[PDB]
């Protein structure tokens, strides 16, 4: 289904990477957040929902979504409740030297992942959303 | 052309909002940045390029792109060099009370703008990129 996203946090260099995967296409949005808090998840959800038709959200840690602030963001954006962290960490390690900050390398790995091809993840998400 | 984005900063509450507009569709990405620096523009460009096919970038302030760090981000993402800030500020003011932080209100205004309809800005950008 075109509106299903999976959201999770992973850890690297003592920092937290919030990874959102459009399940139907494998397309990734990811950001380095200062702490693994409900406020950061709520804000990230608001950002994501403004850029993509986010209908339902899955996670591998259901307690991520128990926050009063997270439920309000979902409420406001009309969101209901519905590996890749290894692939993203692999690309991060490949490009890790190309940048000082981990957050820069994360965006590089997101770029590479979404455009790597026989279409790419970025190519088939816009097709999925367009046809639907 | 589907790869043309316009990037600018605007000011509100002593803070800086970086606004990127997909010119062909009117679709907006916007973030609150701590300062109007080349590093923040470079990082924002890296984020944008990983999510959309960014080919060329325009701006209303050409000195935004003179930074050595900005030119490197463009170089790495394959980017070449090619109102709405009033409409975004208007929506921000409408939803300004719904949130404490300006950055939250910005994302709300982005959400509203991209999904307001007779298609919406978010709808026609994915169509433009899909057909192309
Ligand atoms: C912190 C930083 N400083 C930078 C650059 C660059 C290219 C230069 C010249 N400088 C100044 C410098 C470096 N060494 N010296 C002695 C001076 C980059 C960078 C790295 C890769 C890309 Cl594609 C684009 C920019 C970054 C990146 O941070 C962002 C937030 C992305 C700006 C990062 O995380 O590496
Ligand atoms: C800072 C903040 N705290 C919040 C919320 C909510 C809903 C609650 C309950 N709290 C705790 C609270 C508030 N008052 N009291 C006494 C305790 C929100 C919020 C506002 C709008 C949406 Cl859709 C979603 C969340 C935010 C937003 O920040 C982000 C970064 C988005 C979390 C913001 O900028 O308002």
Author numbering:
A (entry chain A), B (entry chain A): 57 to 138, 153 to 187, 193 to 207
Question: What wording appears in the published article?
Answer:
Next, we determined the X-ray structure of the HIV-1 IN catalytic core domain (CCD) (F185H) in complex with STP0404 at 2.2 Å resolution. STP0404 binds to the V-shaped pocket formed by two interacting CCD subunits, which is also the principal binding site for LEDGF/p75. Superposition of the STP0404 structure with prior quinoline based BI-D and pyridine based KF-116 bound structures revealed that STP0404 maintains many of the critical interactions of the ALLINI family. The carboxylic acid moiety of STP0404 is engaged in a bi-dentate hydrogen bonding interaction with the backbone amides of E170 and H171 of subunit 2 of the CCD dimer with an additional hydrogen bonding interaction with the protonated Nδ of H171. The hydroxyl group of T174 and the protonated Nδ of H171 also interact with the ether oxygen of the tert-butoxy moiety of STP0404. The chloro-phenyl group extends up into the hydrophobic pocket, which is capped by W132 of subunit 1. The pyrazole moiety of the compound extends out from the core of the compound and does not directly interact with the CCD dimer. However, there could be important interactions between this group and the C-terminal domain (CTD) in the context of a full-length IN as seen with other ALLINIs. While A128 lies in close proximity to the pyrrolopyridine ring of STP0404, its substitution with bulkier and polar Thr is likely to create steric hindrance for the inhibitor. Y99 lies deep inside the V-shaped pocket, and our X-ray crystal structure of the IN-STP0404 complex failed to reveal a direct contact between STP0404 and Y99.
